[PDB]
Amino acid sequence: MRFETLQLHAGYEPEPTTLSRQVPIYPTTSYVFKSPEHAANLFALKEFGNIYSRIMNPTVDVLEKRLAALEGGKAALATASGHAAQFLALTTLAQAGDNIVSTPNLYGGTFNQFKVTLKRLGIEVRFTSREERPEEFLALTDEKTRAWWVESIGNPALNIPDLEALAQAAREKGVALIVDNTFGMGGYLLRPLAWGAALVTHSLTKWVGGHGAVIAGAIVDGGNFPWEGGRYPLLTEPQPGYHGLRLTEAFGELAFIVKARVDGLRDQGQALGPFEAWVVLLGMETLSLRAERHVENTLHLAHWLLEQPQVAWVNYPGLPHHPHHDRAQKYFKGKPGAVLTFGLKGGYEAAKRFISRLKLISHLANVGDTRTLAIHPASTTHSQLSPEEQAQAGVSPEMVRLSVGLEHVEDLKAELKEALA
């Protein structure tokens, strides 16, 4: 009752000068200053929402306010990519010396970001077991623990975390729980903030954008996590970039999203650009319609793939006899995303053959386009790893990953049948 209307209207009222119905693109680097006073105010953070700059573009501003509305959150901040949003978030609450605790069931790229990049910058990422229990989160946390990280639907095995208990635990302890909600389609399938996460992160490049046209990421702040504790000196310190201003004092419950902007984004410069933000808004306008058709296509193909003689198994979490099926229902109302996995009975060789017979389905490594995508990681993504380190990563040699698009399901059935022969 309302997502459908937010995704068309939240964050933008027709611009007063032109009364344009569509959001304008402001391919600008700069904004003339209304007066020296307004200009003094901008640099002092005294007129926050109202003066535009190299770090708040008005086209990007619509995207942000809209995303916050779609996630049930209070404010959002866009960046040049999902990776840059994860990095800017973590780097806003943590500095060299700190650590964070993460599920290890991570998107290939976020694993490496944790293990190599953050490590090098003196931010220790400690990993839970693959079952990512709240106990193990708690067990790994100490005075310098700065966040816990988990994904709405985890990387290789498509597990759903134990989100309610995780959130209660993190809050109980006073750690910011951050959920990478990319697989929750912008809050449509799931809003982690509603279940008590502190912060959400997205690769908008995937289903929010939707059309495989732009790379983009975002952080969404619920505005309800106490930064005051003593766990977040970075948020409470007087701020050297702003002449000793205290962000928790000037901005209260929004101090995080404000800091990520005026400090992290200001210094590191992962600007999302305005055309790109504009192209995201376009895909956001149909987010719920694509979401629904995605998830229906995915269920249908999950069932169908099992009835197939050449298929050993299928891993979608919305299948009835799945490990985490109760969780699919609790969190995603029965609709846990649009990525499934399946093993071929003819193994690695047959998986390779299947990819080579694809015609309509595209052979590539992304997820979340309108078009249906397939990859055989064992021969591709992870082909640099030995089979033993592969199996180590949860990558089984006969597994194909399907990111199910919006084509007619009968056309997809015909294609899969052909490719599987």
Add this chain to the structure above:
Amino acid sequence: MRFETLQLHAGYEPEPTTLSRQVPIYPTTSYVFKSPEHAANLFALKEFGNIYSRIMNPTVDVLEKRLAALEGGKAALATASGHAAQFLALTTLAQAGDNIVSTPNLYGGTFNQFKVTLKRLGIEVRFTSREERPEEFLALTDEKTRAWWVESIGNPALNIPDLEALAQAAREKGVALIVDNTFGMGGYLLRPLAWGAALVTHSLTKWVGGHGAVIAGAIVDGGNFPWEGGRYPLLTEPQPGYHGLRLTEAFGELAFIVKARVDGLRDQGQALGPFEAWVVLLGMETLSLRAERHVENTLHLAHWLLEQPQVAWVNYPGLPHHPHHDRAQKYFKGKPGAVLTFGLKGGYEAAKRFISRLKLISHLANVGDTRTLAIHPASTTHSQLSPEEQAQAGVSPEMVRLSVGLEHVEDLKAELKEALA
């Protein structure tokens, strides 16, 4: 003493809402109506320049006002291309039964437009001889003559017309003289309105655009030609699209550019789109700088080509022995555009060979890019005419057309020398 500043500022003040320094792109189909009264006014032509619509876009509006300023004119109107600007102009002042008189030294596409398209819609185009003398215009004029057409620099001989005398003659007769000023680089090299033309037309796709990136055209109105004479019932009639409004009464000296918008553009729909307009404004920003380097490069190469053993002749109206050299001086301050022509002494074959040895210069049919362009019309553009109907068109079989770009003239010399062996 001002063109340089006009091409950066005319037509746009930072939008009051965002104070954007760059001009926004308004990729919008519509504008919300402020109130029903404002909407009544828009449809009645009552608050002309102030309310935006599908036929006045604000990004396109900046390009128009800016071009009018660069031409010394009063108002302009943009279209989806140079052809469409020419068709919309002629179709605004002429209807079935009328005729117009034109030089026949026309850009390839405009010839066809006159001879096939206009003819079929019952608008007769009568041709002067190749010397386009004002008295030949007069000779061909009658009660129903609606305009005279000439180009600032005609094709293919690169003749410059007898512009002052032509303009006096047309005005003394009360016919609209229209100059296709494309080769005048948006008013930079020449402003026909300053010499008394009624209207100017451009293929913005060429030097005004400048980067070969966008197709675009425009009409520019001097706002000083009397339409009330009885020669222009189309302009004075009560107007059936607007409940019998008389455009000469409501808009006085701007009635033509207004009609072209609210009537011809509204019915025919050659909209220039706003990205495209935005990209033109970007090239307009450097027009004068490109213009000067173009014309310098052209002179140097015109001289250099004559010293070349393999070159029989060079046609460039800025060479000092040229027929119409006095005219280059009167009209273009010594700088008559950036297209030249030259014949190879090894004829058609050597011309084909030269084009086949180009590396840096691009082989294509088009003028006015930043990059230097070459074509051999006898083997290409006109390859379907017999040699004698070729010679008839002024297309001699050894002629190469060079549209001279902005690369370093020494690199161009090294390339030509070597293409010419």
